GROMACS .gro file of C-alpha atoms in nm:
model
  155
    1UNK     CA    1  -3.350   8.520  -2.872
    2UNK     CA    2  -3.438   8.238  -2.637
    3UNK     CA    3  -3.715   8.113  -2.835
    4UNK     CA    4  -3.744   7.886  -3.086
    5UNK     CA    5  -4.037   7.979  -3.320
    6UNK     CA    6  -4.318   8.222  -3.271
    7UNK     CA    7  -4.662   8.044  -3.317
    8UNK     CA    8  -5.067   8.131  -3.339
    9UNK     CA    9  -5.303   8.092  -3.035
   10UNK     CA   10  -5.638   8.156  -3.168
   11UNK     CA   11  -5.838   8.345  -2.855
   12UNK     CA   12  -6.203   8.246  -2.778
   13UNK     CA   13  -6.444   8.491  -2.821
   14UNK     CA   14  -6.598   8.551  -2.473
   15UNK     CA   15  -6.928   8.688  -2.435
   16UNK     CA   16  -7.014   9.119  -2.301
   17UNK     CA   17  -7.075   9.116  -1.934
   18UNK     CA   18  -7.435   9.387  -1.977
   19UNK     CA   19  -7.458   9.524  -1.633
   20UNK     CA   20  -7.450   9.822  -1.468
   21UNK     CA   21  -7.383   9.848  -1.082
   22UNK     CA   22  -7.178  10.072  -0.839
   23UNK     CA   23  -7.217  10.219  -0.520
   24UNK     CA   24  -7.145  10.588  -0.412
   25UNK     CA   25  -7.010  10.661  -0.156
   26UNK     CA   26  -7.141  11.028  -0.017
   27UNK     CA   27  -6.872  11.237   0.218
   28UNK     CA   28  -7.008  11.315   0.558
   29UNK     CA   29  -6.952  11.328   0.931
   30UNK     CA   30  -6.916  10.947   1.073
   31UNK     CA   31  -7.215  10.801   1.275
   32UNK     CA   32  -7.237  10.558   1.604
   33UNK     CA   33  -7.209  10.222   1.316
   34UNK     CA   34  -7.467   9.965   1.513
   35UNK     CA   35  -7.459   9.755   1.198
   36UNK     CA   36  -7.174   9.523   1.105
   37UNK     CA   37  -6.970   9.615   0.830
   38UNK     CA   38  -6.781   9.427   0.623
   39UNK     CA   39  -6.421   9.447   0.750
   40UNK     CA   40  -6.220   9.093   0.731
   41UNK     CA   41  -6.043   9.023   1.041
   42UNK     CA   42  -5.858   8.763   1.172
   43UNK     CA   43  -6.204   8.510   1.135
   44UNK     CA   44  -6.249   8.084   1.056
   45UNK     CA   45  -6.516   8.322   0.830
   46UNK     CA   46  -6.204   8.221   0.509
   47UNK     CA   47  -6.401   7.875   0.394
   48UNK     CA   48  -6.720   8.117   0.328
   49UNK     CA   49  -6.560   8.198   0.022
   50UNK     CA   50  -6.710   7.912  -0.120
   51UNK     CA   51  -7.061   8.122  -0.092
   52UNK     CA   52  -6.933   8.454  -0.093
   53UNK     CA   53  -6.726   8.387  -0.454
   54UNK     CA   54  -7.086   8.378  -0.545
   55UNK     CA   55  -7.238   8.652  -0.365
   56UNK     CA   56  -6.940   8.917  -0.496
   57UNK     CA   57  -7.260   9.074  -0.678
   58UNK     CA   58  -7.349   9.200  -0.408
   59UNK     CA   59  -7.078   9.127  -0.089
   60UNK     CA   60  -6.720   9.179  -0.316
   61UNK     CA   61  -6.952   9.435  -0.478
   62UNK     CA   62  -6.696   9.702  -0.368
   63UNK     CA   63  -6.362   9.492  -0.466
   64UNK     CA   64  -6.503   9.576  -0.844
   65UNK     CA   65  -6.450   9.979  -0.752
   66UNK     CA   66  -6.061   9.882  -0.699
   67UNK     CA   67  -5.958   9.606  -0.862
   68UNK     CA   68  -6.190   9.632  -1.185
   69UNK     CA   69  -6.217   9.981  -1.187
   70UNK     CA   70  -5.838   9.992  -1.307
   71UNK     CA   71  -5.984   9.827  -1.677
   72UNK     CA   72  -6.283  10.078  -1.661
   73UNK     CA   73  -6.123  10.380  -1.609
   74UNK     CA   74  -5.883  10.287  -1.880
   75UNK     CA   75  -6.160  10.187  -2.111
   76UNK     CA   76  -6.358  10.500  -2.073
   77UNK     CA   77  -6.421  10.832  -2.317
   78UNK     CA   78  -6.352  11.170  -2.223
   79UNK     CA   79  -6.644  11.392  -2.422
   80UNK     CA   80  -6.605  11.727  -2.424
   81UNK     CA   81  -6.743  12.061  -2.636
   82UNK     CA   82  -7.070  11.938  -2.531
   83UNK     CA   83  -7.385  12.157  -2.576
   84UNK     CA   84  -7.450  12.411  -2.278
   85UNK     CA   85  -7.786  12.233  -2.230
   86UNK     CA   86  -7.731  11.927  -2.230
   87UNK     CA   87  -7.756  11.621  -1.970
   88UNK     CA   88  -7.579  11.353  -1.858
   89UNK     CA   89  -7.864  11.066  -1.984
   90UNK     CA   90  -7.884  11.162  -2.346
   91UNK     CA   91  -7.488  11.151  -2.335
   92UNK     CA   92  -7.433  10.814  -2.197
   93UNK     CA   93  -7.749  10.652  -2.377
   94UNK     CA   94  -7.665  10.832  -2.699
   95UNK     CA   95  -7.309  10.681  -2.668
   96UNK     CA   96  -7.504  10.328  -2.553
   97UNK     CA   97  -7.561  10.246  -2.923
   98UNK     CA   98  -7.215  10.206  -2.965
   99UNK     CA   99  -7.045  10.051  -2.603
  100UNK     CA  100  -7.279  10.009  -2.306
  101UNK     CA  101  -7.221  10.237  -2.063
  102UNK     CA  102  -7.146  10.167  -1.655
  103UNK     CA  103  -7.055  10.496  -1.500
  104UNK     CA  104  -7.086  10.845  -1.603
  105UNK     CA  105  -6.984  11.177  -1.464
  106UNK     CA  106  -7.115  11.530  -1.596
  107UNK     CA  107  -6.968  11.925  -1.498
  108UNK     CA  108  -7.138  12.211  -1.590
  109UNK     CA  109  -6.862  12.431  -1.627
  110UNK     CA  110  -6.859  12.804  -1.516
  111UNK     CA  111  -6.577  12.952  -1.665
  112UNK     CA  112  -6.707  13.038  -2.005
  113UNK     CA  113  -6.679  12.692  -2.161
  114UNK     CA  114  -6.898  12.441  -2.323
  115UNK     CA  115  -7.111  12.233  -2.045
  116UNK     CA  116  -7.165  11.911  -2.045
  117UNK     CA  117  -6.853  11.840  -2.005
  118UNK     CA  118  -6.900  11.383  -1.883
  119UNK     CA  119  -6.707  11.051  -1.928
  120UNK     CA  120  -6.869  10.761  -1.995
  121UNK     CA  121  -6.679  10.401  -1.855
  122UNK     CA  122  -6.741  10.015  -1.870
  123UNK     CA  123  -6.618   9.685  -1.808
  124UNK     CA  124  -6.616   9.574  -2.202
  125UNK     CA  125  -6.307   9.694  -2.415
  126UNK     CA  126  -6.525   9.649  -2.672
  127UNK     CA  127  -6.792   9.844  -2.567
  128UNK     CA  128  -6.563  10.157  -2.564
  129UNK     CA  129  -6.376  10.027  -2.865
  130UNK     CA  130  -6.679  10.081  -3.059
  131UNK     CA  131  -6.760  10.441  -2.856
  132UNK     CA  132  -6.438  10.599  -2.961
  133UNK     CA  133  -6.437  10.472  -3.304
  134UNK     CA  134  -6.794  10.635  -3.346
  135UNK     CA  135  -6.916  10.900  -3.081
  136UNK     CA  136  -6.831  11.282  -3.217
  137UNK     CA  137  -7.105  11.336  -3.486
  138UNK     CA  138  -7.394  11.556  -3.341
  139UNK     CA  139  -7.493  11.571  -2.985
  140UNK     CA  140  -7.817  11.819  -2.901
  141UNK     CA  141  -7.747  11.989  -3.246
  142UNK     CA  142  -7.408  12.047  -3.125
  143UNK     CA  143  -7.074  11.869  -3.217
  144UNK     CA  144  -6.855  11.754  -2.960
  145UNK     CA  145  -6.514  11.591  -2.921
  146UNK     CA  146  -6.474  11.242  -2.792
  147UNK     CA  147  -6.094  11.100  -2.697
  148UNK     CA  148  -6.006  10.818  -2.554
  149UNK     CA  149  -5.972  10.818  -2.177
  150UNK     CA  150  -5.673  10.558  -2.141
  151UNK     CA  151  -5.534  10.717  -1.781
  152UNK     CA  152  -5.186  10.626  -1.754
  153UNK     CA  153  -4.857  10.734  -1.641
  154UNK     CA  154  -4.628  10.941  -1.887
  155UNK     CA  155  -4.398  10.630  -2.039
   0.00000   0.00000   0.00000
């Protein structure tokens, strides 16, 4: 109830942002930092964001690992039954002719079961819309499965 009639509001079709970026960050004993880093503090520095809105490329590079990395890791494939010898490029690039691929993470598993085991992410819903529609076919020689990786809580 509450509204009167339901209408149609054709979307515009927007255009695939192709890039791939991301730093990693490597776990390690903390050094004497003689560098500046970029912490925001209580600074007149707030009108830069006239330049630095432009510069997020590279400056709000890291905001992209928080904020945009909640639509990436919910627009990601989880492949697994992978061939024992295979590697982590001919996954993602394989998987490339379907959704461009960001990120990926392999694990050669020690347990007993199949290697390979990666997930491929990206920015583009359509890029992975594409990946799980088509992805599981032949891999190496080998057949895998590919599921969507939607993370989410159970409700």
């Amino acid at each position: 109830m509450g509204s009167s009639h339901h209408h149609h509001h054709h979307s515009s079709g927007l255009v695939p942002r192709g890039s791939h970026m991301g730093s990693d960050l490597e776990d390690m004993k903390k050094r004497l930092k003689e560098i500046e880093e970029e912490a925001g503090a209580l600074r007149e520095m707030q009108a830069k964001v006239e330049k630095e809105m432009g510069a997020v490329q590279d400056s709000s590079s890291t905001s992209a690992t928080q904020a945009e990395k909640e639509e990436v890791d919910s627009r990601s494939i989880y492949v697994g039954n992978v061939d024992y010898a295979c590697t982590p490029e001919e996954v993602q690039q394989h998987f490339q002719s379907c959704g461009t691929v960001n990120r990926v993470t392999i694990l050669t598993d020690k347990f007993g079961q199949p290697k390979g085991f990666a997930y491929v992410e990206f920015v583009e819903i359509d890029a992975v819309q594409n990946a799980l529609l088509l992805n599981e076919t032949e891999l190496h020689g080998r057949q895998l499965k590919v599921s969507a990786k939607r993370t989410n809580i159970p409700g």
